[model samples]
Every structure is written in C-alpha cells, then in structure tokens.
Target chain A: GRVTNQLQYLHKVVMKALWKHQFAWPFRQPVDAVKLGLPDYHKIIKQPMDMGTIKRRLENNYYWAASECMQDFNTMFTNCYIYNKPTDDIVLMAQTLEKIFLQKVASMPQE
Target chain B: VTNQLQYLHKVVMKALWKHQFAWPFRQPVDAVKLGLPDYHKIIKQPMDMGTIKRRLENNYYWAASECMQDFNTMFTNCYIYNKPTDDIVLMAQTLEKIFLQKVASMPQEEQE
Candidate 1:
C-alpha cells in the first residue's frame, strides 16, 4: 500500500510517453512504418493493397528501412565502442534492412 | 549478395567457447578501410568446401547474421518488385570489402 501511488505514477509516465511519442509523429503516408521506435511492417501488408499505390509506398518504406542500415551498421559493426552507440540503431537498422529485404522479394523475377 | 551473406557466420561461435568479442570496426575509418566485399569477387562460384568433414566440422557454422537474415526475410516477401535499392547497392559494395577480411581472417584465427 505504501508504494502503490509511486508505482501508479510510473505507469502514468509510461502511458503519457507512449501517447506523446505517437502524437509527435505517426506512420507515413501510403503507410511506410518507421525509422523510429517500433519497426513493424506498418501493419500495412496486413491490410488490403491499393494495388499500385500502397504497394509502392510499402516498397519504399521497406526500401528505405533496409537500405537505412548503412550508416549505423558501419558504426556499430566497426567501432570498438559499439556499445556506446545506441543498440537500438542497429536493431532499427535490422528492422529497416528487413524492410529492404521485403522490397527485394517484391522485385525478384519468379521461377 | 547470396554468397556474401553465405555463412560468414560459420565463424560466429562455439557456444562452448563463445565470447561476445568487439564490434567489427574500431572506428568509422576502420569500417571504410575494412569495407565490405562481395563473395563473387573473393570466392569461386559453386564454392568448394574440400570435403564433408570440413562441412560437418563446421556444421554449426551457418553464420550469416541475425540482421542480415532479417534483411533476407523481408526481401523474400513479394515478387512484383525487381531490383536492389540504391542503398543496398551502395551499402553492399562498402560492406563487401570488409566481409572479405572477415572471410580471410576468421578461419585462420579459429584454427589457431
């Protein structure tokens, strides 16, 4: 009971930060997911496609995302103090490069 | 690309002797100097393994990388698109050179 309010306050801060971050910037148009925090596929792939429209956008997002790994990957992969770099950048880089990977699959000539 | 990502990780670890080790580069220039290398440039096509013992000995060596695999997974999703992005093209070029170094050094280090 003594610490209930303090714990609740911590919960309150997390909720506020979550919402605040979302408010700061939401998903991209035509719906590319992120270079930010959560690197999901923007759930766009789960939704119906505009055929050409959204497919193109998701491709770009995936394109930029995976391609985005160059800088951070180089930084963390090379530098000795990689731990000094935010672990999340490479995580994000992986997530994004993930997006790039998707783009490649999209463009590949089928068998 | 297929070859570059090839079990570069074959050298990743021996969980029994696994150690977290340092990042691949010590500095930006290190990365630039080390650079990325494509397998095609450094390896023969249908790359030879010498023998099954070598393959089996390094059986646990499918060591491409988690992130690299992530990229592969994403790249697998669709077929309508048809090209590597500019970023991938450029990034791959840079990383390939560095990769050659890993390929050249890892087995020797592990052997010793």
Candidate 2:
C-alpha cells in the first residue's frame, strides 16, 4: 500500500504538471483507447474503466503485478498526450497506475 | 514551457518523416543520454538529411545553447516537459542529425 502510495503520488505530479504546463492542442471528440494504440490504457475519458477484471491474474512477484497493469497504465498515460490535454481522469487513473508500477503493494516480490 | 519545445518537437518529428507516417526507430534502441548507435542508419532516412545536417553546422550546436541538458529532462520542468522520454527516445537522435547539419550551414561558425 505504501509503495502504491508513492507511485500514485509521483504519477499524479507528472499528470498535473503535463496538464498545467502542456496545452498545445485539444481533441475534438473522445476516441476509444484501443484505437489510439493504447489497447491496455486505463480510462476516465468519455468512458471509464479499471484493472478490476485483470487483477485476477497476479503473482506475488511485484514485477508481474506491475507488468499486468503496465499496458493499461501506459495507454491511460499516452491518452494524456493524445486526448484534449490532461484531465482530472488522467490524474485519477495515475493513482491506479502508480499502485502497480511503483508501489508493488502485495506484488513486490522478495528477492 | 513545453509550447516552444513541443512545437519544435512536432516540427522535427514531421521533418523526420517527410510526407508519410514513417517510423524512424524501425528496430529499437534506448537513448538514456544524448547518444546514438549506428548513426548511419537514421542518417539515411528523413526527407533532407543533407539540408537538415547543414542546418546546424556539423553538430554540437545544441551544446552551445544549454540545449542538450534540456533534452534529458522531464516535461513539467521549466526547461522541458515532465516527460523526457521523447527527449531520450526520439528527439536526441533526430536533433543531433538536424542540428549538426544546421550549424554546419552557419556562415560565421567553423565546421566540426
């Protein structure tokens, strides 16, 4: 939980900075994540979803957990760039991403 | 902020793929710093490698402006975006090629 917290915070900071600092162009409509080459990205755009279904497949190894979520996490992040700038959803989804990618929580494997 | 860099980034990227959606890193490589492997491969691509190279005067021009440091930075930073991946991944290579040619074309500067 703590590791997830740290990653969640870091990813959040990045999303906010990107949102506030970069505002080049805005998307006209919300495109599906699968089309943007973000087939595994987390979502909060016109539609929203999470890794609830995929969490079923997990190993105690932190790397695997992070891997499981990496696809969605990257997609959600890539959308932060492709969609109309950054949005609240972008930051919100980062919470989930950091949890798996950085914090490890129940996933971090002991070496 | 990223506006200028981002704008320039798009320009450089488009120029990398003159008319179509051409992917430069057809294979793959990691650019942790302002470095490259097999520089010849990328040089052969792009629209006008000759002109782009001439634009910067045979490289090192970016070093002349505190620009190289900016590339290895994050996007949110005042100098670059919080995401430096593009800097590490894409721009570093293209920038080197483009600027080397750029500075080479300069009238007052000596070639490298």
Candidate 3:
C-alpha cells in the first residue's frame, strides 16, 4: 500500500507535467482517425494509448504496480512511432516527451 | 509509414510459410487439444502465421516493426508454452531465425 501510494503521487506529478508540456496537445486523447480523415489509422495502430487514458487509469488507482503505468506511457509513445515516420514532427515531439518522462521517473523517489 | 512495407511484409510472410519448421506455428496453438489449459494465461498475446497472414491480407500492418512484432510474438509464445528442451522450442527458434534473415535481406524503406 505504501509503495502504491508513493507511485500514485509520482504518476500524478508526472502526468500533470506532461499535460502542460507543449508537445502534449496531440497525445492528450485518443486519435480520431475519422475526424482527421485518416481512415486507415486503426489498422496501423493496433494498440493505441493516450495521456488522457493513462490519466483516467491513474485517477481510478488502476495501476497496481509502477511498471504498469510506466508501460502505458511507453506504449503511448511507441504507437506514435509505429504510425508516423521517424522524421515526422509528431515523432520528434514524442522523442522529446519520452526523454522528459524518463528523466522525471528516474529522479522521483520510488518505493 | 507507407504501404510499401506492407507489400514487402506480404512477401516475407509467404517465405515464412514455406519453411519446414513453420508447421507448428502456421496456426494458433490448440490449447484444448494439447491439454494445456493454462496456455492463454502464460501467453497473453498468442500469435501465429495464419493470423498474421489474415491481418496482412486485411492491410492491418502499418509498419515493418508492427509486422515483425507478430512474428516475434509467435515464436516467443512457443518458447513460453514449451520447455527449453522441447522440439517445438527448437522449431520456433529456427523458424524465427529464418524469418529474420528473410526480413534483413529485404529492402529497407524510410521507416520501419
């Protein structure tokens, strides 16, 4: 319980920071391929994830282990890599966001 | 990523199907018939060539990495369900090697 509580706080902090990051706009919610007129998005990104989805899980205390939340964050970034080119601006933003996330996680206290 | 990787992946899938060791991995492992009731528990994401083939036909794969992930999962599941000394493990390892070789030899596009 102590570990979970600590992880919960850490996740909250990290998530809030990500929510305000300049590059976070595109990743806050699920990609609406229909809205974007990219009908083939679903086929390309089989396992989609987003900051909003992760935030919901965090709010509900869904992550029993720190690794679970960490995995979701990584998955969110990886899906971007899968659907976009390495040279795309979105991908570049994700690269930066991933670095920021890892730094934050690394500096935080974890039980 | 463009459909170029998809076209190339289709070619790779065809070659993998023709491998001798590809028999056990051609279709989903029948857990009931095999008497491994806990198969699904251990292998959370079960994969096989048949499923991959169908997905490929439906244009499910967007990048080379996504296509390769299925192949990797199929072999990884085999390793997880079967013991290290089991013949199936060897078969999976062999087939995975062959598949990687085929992919490596293929042309590289802008993105994976």
Candidate 4:
C-alpha cells in the first residue's frame, strides 16, 4: 500500500511535469483551437504535414518526465527499505507501476 | 533507437530472471490439484477443494514470467541501439518482433 501511494504521488508529479513542460502552451492551445473550430488539428494531420518536430518534442518531454519519475520512485523505495520494509514486493510493485505507465504513454495521442 | 532497444532488452532480461528465480518449480503438481486445470476440471471437483498454496504458486509464476519478459525485451533493445540504427524504423521493428515473440511464447506448452 505504501508503494502504491508512492506511485500515485509520482503519477501526479509526472502529470504536473507534463503539464508544465510538454503541454505548456503559451496560450490555451486546446481551448483556442476549439474556439476556432479546428478540432485539435495537432491530434490529426499526419503524413506530409511534417509534424515530426512537434511529435519529437512531445516524445522527448515524455521521456524526460518518465526518467524523473523513475528517479523519484527509486529514491522512495530506498527510503522504504531503510524503514525495514525490504522486500521483493516493493520492487515488483514498482515494475508493475512502470509497465502500466509506459503502456499508457505509448497509447497517447499520435498525429 | 537506443532507448527503445534498451527497453526491449530489459524486457527479455526480466523474462529470463522470472524463468530462473521464480519458476524454479521444486515439484510438478497436477493442474487439477493446483486448481488451475483446464475447464474440464470443473466437473472433477465441485467446491470445498481449498488449494490455496498451489493456486498462489501458479499466480506467482505468472507474475514472474511477466517480469522476466519485460527485462529481456529491454536488453534486446540496448543491443540494437549499439548497432546505431534509426529510431522510427528499427525501434518499430524491435517492438513488432517482441510482440510476436510474446504471442508465440504464449503457446500452452511453452507457458509451462
């Protein structure tokens, strides 16, 4: 349960990082696009549109957030170990958390 | 590309670890006795068969195999990255390969 709590905290932190770094549009892109009737063009129009730059930027940001989350999770586990909870259960839990996180990240919008 | 390969290789290494450390079954128990036999076993034992130990072991093995496959796949990716391949293509290929490998590995006999 402690590990799960730690993971939930990290998920929030990662989401914060994503909001701050990756999706931090100077203006509310999503809101503005909706108002303009664009219907989130960034989420579509692949191919010759050459949105590779945008895509790569998002990918890099996601990787950065993931790395940060892993570091924090590892530190939390080490602290848990010091507190006399040294067990494979924690490691397995962390792995499961990461696996689920990566699956979600991989399935994110790709245009 | 390097990152993707690293991920794949990790999956394979984890899979190997699961195979080694976890599934080192000390003894072979009957699937029916373990409470994990095919659907046919339902007719053999109708309730009150408390096989918690066997059922837990089966669950543990399943978890271990999942972890091992994860590590092995990551290690495979690192090897591919060392070869200096492109991202979109080579990484995609590696992912597809692992996806297929996992499916093949899922054969009933292979799972055992």
> Deviation in angstroms for A61 in model 3?
1.0
Higher-ranked by DockQ: 2 or 3: 3
Docking tier of model 1: it is incorrect
lDDT digits (tens) for residues B1-112 of candidate 4 = 2222333234532343244322322233245675645423322222111231233334433333343334333332222222223242333334333443442222222122
Residue B17 accuracy (lDDT) in model 1: 15
- Give the DockQ (2 decimals) of all models: 0.01, 0.01, 0.02, 0.02
In the range B1-112, model 2's lDDT, one tens digit per residue, is 2222232234443454352322333222233343655333422222223333343334323422222222211111211122323443233334434432332222222122
TM-score of 1: 0.20
Could you give candidate 1's per-residue lDDT for residues A15-96 as a string of tens digits? 2232233221221122234543435433313331221332333334432331222222222222211111223343343334
lDDT of 1 by residue, B9-105 (tens): 3432221013222122111212234463432232221211122124335553343332234322222211111123324333333443343223322
Tens-digit lDDT track of model 3 for B24-108: 8878989998899978876777899999888877778766556666775676456545653478866775675555445433433
TM-score of each: 0.20, 0.24, 0.48, 0.21
**Where is model 3 chain B poorest over a 10-residue stretch in terms of lDDT?**
B103-112
Model 2 — TM-score against the truth?
0.24
Better of 1 and 4 by TM-score: 4
**lDDT winner:** 3
Go through the candidates in order and give each one's C-alpha lDDT. Answer: 0.28, 0.31, 0.68, 0.32
Off by over 4 Å in 1: A1-27, A30-54, A57-111, B1-57, B62-67, B70-93, B96-112
Per-residue lDDT, model 1, residue B110, is: 18
